Short mmCIF file of C-alpha atoms in Angstrom, two decimals:
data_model
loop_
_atom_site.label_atom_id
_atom_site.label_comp_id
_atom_site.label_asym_id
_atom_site.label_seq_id
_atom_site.Cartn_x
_atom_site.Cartn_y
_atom_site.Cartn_z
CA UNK A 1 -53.19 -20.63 1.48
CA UNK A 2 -53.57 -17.15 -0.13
CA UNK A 3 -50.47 -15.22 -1.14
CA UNK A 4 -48.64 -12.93 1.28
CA UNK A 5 -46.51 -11.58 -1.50
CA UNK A 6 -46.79 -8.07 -1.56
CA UNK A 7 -47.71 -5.80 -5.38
CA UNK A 8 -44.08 -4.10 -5.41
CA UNK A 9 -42.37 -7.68 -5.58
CA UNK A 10 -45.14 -9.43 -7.60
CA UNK A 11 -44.63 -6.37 -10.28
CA UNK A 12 -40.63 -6.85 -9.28
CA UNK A 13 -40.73 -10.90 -9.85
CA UNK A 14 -42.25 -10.77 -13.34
CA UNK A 15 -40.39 -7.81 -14.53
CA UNK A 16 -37.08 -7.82 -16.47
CA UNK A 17 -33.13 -7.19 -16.01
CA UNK A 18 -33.04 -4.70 -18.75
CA UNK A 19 -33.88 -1.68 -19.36
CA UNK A 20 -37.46 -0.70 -21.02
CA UNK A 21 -37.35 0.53 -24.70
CA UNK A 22 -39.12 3.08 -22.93
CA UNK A 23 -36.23 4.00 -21.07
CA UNK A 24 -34.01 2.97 -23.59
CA UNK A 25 -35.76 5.80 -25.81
CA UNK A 26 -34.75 8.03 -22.82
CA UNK A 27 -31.16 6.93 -22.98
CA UNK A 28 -30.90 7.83 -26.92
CA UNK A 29 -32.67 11.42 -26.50
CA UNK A 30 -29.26 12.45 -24.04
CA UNK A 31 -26.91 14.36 -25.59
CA UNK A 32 -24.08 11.76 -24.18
CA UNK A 33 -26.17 8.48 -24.35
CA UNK A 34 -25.86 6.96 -21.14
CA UNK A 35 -26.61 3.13 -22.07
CA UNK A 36 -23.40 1.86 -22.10
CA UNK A 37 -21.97 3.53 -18.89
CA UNK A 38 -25.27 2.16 -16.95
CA UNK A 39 -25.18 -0.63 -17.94
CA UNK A 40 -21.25 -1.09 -17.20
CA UNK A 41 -21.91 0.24 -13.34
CA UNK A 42 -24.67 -2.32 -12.86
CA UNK A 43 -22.74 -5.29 -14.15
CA UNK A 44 -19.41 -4.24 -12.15
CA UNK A 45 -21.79 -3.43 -8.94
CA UNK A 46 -23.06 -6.47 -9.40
CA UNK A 47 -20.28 -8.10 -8.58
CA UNK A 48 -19.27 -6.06 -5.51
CA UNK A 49 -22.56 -7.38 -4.78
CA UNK A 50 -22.31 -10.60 -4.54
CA UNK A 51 -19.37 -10.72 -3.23
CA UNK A 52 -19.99 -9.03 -0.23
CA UNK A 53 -23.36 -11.16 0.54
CA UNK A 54 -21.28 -14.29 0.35
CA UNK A 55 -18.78 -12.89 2.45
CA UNK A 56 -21.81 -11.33 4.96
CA UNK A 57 -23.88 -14.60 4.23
CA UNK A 58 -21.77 -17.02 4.28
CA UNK A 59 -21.68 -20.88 2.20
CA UNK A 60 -23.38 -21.29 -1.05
CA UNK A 61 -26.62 -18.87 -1.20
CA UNK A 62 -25.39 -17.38 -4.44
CA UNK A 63 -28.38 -18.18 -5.90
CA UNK A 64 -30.00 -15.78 -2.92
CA UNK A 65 -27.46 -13.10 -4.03
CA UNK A 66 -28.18 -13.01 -7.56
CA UNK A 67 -32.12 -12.74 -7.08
CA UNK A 68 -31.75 -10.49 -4.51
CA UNK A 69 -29.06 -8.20 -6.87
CA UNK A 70 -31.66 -9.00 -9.63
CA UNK A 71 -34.54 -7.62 -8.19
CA UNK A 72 -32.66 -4.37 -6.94
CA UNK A 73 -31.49 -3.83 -10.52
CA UNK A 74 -35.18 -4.05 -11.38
CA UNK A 75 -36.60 -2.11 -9.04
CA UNK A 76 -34.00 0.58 -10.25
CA UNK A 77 -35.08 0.69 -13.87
CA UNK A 78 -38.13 0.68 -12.91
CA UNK A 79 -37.49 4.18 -10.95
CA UNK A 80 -35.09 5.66 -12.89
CA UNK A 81 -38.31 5.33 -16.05
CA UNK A 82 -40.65 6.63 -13.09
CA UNK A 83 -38.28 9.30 -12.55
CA UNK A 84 -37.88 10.51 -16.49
CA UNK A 85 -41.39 10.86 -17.40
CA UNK A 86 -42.44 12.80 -13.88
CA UNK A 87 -38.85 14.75 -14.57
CA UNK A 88 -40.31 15.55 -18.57
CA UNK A 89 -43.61 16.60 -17.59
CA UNK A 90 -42.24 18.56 -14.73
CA UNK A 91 -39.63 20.29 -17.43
CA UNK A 92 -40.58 19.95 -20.08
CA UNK A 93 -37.41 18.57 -21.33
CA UNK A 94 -36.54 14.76 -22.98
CA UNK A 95 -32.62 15.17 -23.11
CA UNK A 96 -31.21 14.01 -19.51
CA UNK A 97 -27.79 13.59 -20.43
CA UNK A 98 -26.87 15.50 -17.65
CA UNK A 99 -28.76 13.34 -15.18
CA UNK A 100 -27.98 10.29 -16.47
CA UNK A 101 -24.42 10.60 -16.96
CA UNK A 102 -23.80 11.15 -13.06
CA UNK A 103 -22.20 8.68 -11.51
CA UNK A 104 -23.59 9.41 -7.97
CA UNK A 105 -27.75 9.37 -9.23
CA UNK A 106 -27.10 6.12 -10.57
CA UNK A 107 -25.29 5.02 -7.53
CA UNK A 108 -27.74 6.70 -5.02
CA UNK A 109 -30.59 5.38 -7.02
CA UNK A 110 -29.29 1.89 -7.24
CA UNK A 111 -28.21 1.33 -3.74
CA UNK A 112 -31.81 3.02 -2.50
CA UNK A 113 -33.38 -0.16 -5.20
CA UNK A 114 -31.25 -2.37 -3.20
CA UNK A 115 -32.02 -1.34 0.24
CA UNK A 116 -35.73 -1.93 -0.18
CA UNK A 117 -35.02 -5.44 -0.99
CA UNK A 118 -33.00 -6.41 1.47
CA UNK A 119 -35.31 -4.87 3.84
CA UNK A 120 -38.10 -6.72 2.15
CA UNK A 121 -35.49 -9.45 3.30
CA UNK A 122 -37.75 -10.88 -0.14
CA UNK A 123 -38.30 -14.36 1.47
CA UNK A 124 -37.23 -13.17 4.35
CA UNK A 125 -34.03 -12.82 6.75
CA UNK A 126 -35.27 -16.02 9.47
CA UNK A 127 -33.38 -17.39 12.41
CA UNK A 128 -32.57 -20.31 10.03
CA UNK A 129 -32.98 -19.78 6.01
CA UNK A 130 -30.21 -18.40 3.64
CA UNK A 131 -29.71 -14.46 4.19
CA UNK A 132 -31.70 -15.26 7.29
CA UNK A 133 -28.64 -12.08 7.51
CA UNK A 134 -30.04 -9.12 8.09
CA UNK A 135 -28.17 -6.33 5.47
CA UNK A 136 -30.42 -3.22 6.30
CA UNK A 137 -29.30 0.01 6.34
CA UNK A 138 -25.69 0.96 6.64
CA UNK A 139 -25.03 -2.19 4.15
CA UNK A 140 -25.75 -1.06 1.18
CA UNK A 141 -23.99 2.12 1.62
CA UNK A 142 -20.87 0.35 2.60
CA UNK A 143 -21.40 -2.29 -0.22
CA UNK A 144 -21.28 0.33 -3.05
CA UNK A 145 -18.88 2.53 -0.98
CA UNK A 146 -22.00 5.33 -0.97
CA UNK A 147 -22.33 8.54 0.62
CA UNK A 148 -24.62 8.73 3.79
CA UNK A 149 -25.74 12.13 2.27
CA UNK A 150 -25.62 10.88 -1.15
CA UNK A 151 -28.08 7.99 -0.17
CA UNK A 152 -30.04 10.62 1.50
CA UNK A 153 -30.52 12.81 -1.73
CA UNK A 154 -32.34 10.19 -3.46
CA UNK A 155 -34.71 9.08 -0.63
CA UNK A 156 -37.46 11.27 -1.03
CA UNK A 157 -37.98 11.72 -5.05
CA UNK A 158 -37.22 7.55 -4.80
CA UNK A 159 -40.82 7.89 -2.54
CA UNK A 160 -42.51 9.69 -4.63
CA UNK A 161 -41.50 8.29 -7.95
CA UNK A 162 -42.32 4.42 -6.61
CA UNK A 163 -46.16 4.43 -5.52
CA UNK A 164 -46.19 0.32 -5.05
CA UNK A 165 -43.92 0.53 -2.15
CA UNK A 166 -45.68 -0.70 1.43
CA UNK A 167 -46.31 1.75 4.23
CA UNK A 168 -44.03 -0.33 6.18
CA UNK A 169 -40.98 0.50 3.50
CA UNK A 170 -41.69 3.64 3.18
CA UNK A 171 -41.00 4.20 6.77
CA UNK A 172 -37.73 2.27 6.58
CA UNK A 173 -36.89 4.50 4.10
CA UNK A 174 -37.64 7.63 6.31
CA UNK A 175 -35.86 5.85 8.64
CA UNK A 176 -32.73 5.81 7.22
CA UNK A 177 -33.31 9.30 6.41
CA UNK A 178 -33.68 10.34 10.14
CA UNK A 179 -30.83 7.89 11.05
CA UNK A 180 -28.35 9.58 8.22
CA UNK A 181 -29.50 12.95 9.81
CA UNK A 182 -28.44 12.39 13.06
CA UNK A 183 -25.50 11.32 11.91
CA UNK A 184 -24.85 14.75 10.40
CA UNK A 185 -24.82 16.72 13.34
#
């Protein structure tokens, strides 16, 4: 008995796929609003996505795909909000068209979303269950064709901006960092 869920994926598995009209109030301050572009790059990621866990994964766990994609997508609305409001108080600005029309951010941020999950492995990758795969670190970056250094950009703002995630993620996270590093030089 007694729940071993952890408070990032509780928050994660009751939040939604779109955006907050907090965030969405973010989107319409930008000089260029960014909505429809962000939206766009999720959807066609999302696809990439899930086609490259079937192909890693293997017969029908496409419902393990989607809720895996799912809670990524969450996780990265949920820090690109974080992100805004430390960003506006740190600024003392409210138009991040800049920001939010770059390709790369998005990307960064999303696959960084994505790579805590499927290092959460959320049910977890077994010797036996569905995505019982592991798809930790280089994955995501080859799933959404990403930068190593680009990924790396992201990591430590993506830290401070998410305060739910474990100890045990956060040094995943750092992980990849070092990993990406020493792959530099």
């Amino acid at each position: 008995v007694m729940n071993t869920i952890q408070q990032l994926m509780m928050i994660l598995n009751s939040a939604s796929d779109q955006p907050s009209e907090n965030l969405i109030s973010y989107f319409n301050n930008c000089t260029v609003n960014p909505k429809e572009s962000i939206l766009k790059r999720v959807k066609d990621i999302g696809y990439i996505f899930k086609e490259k866990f079937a192909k890693a994964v293997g017969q029908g766990c496409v419902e393990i795909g989607s809720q895996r994609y799912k809670l990524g997508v969450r996780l990265y609305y949920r820090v690109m909000e974080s992100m805004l409001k430390s960003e506006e108080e740190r600024l003392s600005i409210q138009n991040f068209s800049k920001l939010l029309n770059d390709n790369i951010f998005h990307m960064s941020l999303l696959a960084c979303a994505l790579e805590v999950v499927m290092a959460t492995y959320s049910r977890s990758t077994s010797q036996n269950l569905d995505s019982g795969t592991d798809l930790s670190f280089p994955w995501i970056l080859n799933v959404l064709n990403l930068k190593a250094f680009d990924f790396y950009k992201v990591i430590e703002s993506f830290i401070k901006a998410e305060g739910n995630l474990t100890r045990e993620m956060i040094k995943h996270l750092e992980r990849c960092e070092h990993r990406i590093m020493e792959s530099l030089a």
